Symmetry: C2
């Protein structure tokens, strides 16, 4: 199995009321927040701190997430977040995350693709082996492919809402927290849709960075699905018609 | 001392990167979030859950906050949140909170006023002693908390609109009071925020904000007589109706935080 011998770093996290939505379940923003928390803690423990990575003239940037949701963590549940830098090729790193309950049953499974961005030239460079080696990552030629989100196009029922990038959207690394894109994406859908649908799967592709003070336009299409008791939502986050993030979500329709 | 015999409930909390702003320090939203987390856990441990309080046709609604900030918790700091239902009178309940560091030194001190609002009629009902007795709160007068500045708009007032989001409505089907700080603090520009630290905060909640409403946040950056400080006077409204009035005291830093 790819990355079987890579380190599996884990930690426990109590899901707070403020990390949940009105149904008492953790939000997508929270799911990514805790996934990245485990990854940063693994990295810090190996001496791969944000300051140490930045001292090599580079920075890690996530390009894609593929999320399989069995059930979202509940309010006051102590979940286990496990993370693994499973693999890498010259330009891409493949990182996996597991969110499990106290018994170890899988709640969410996240796969991701990360690139190494040069702090000076602002372009993708080869992965510095000293910044991946500590994770015990498996070297590969072909990095695993994550399913691309639906290329967003306008429809007759397209929901559009503006959102301004706030000061609190910028986390300690001086860039916008990617997790906050879900605040905009999910809020585009009406409360009625959100209260009678559960998350099944999410495909995310980060295309262009959104910066402080910019106004993003979040677009959403509620589309039909071939799978029974399911619906698909196609989303786009853009600034001045430049595509920043594309997301496709598979939901399951609740009975009542 | 007001509420000496009242029970002291405490817990530890690890400040995460996502609970902090760009300077690696906890936001005001996080500060209130963890204070209220300590209060709900004290209440759950004593049997006073959100279900049994709501079974009596009533619910706690915070009307006021006075926050004394020595320093905000830092990213990855393990802070101790101590809480106490100090005292109460026929209508108002006085609740205190202490945010302390790993070595026991005080980071923040929060005082507050709470009232019981009916579920059906939506009026200020009398405090039921059964819902306060488990905290061991003394029956009292409750001193008046420091009032915010009465907001007056001027030619230089900073105004920004904010829309209430789905995630702003927390598990009890109401817009979480902590999220008001997202609007209040964001009204001020990053150039101000990056060279100012929190010293004090006063909050008055007049009217609750609901889902689908567009709030209008106002802010005046004012001079202060206190050495190395400035004052910001804030107002959150929903179509010519006061929702929240806030006054924040800040310490001007020698250099901006990169």
């Amino acid at each position: 199995t790819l990355g079987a011998n890579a380190s599996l770093y884990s930690e426990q996290h109590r899901i707070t009321y403020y990390e949940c939505d009105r149904t008492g379940r953790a939000t997508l923003t929270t799911l990514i927040d805790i996934a990245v928390l485990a990854s940063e803690d693994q990295s810090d423990a190996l001496g791969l701190t944000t300051e140490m990575v930045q001292s090599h003239g580079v920075g890690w940037v996530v390009t894609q997430y593929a999320i399989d949701i069995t059930r979202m963590p509940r309010q006051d549940e102590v979940v286990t977040i496990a993370v693994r830098g499973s693999a890498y090729n010259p330009y891409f790193a493949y990182r996996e995350f597991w969110i499990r309950d106290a018994d170890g049953q899988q709640l969410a499974y996240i796969t991701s693709i990360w690139v190494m961005m040069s702090q000076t030239t602002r372009r993708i460079v080869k992965i510095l082996p000293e910044l991946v080696a500590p994770y015990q990552s498996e070297v590969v030629k072909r990095i695993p492919r994550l399913p691309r989100p639906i290329s967003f196009e306008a429809t007759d029922t397209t929901i559009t809402k503006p959102y301004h990038v706030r000061f609190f959207d910028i986390d300690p690394n001086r860039h916008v927290n990617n997790a906050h894109y879900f605040d905009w994406l999910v809020d585009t859908l009406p409360a009625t849709f959100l209260l009678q649908h559960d998350l099944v799967h999410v495909d995310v592709r980060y295309e262009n960075e959104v910066k402080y003070g910019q106004t993003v336009t979040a677009h959403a299409n509620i589309l039909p699905s071939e799978v029974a008791d399911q619906v698909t939502t196609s989303h786009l986050i853009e600034v001045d018609d430049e595509k920043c993030c594309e997301v496709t979500i598979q939901w399951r329709t609740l009975p009542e």
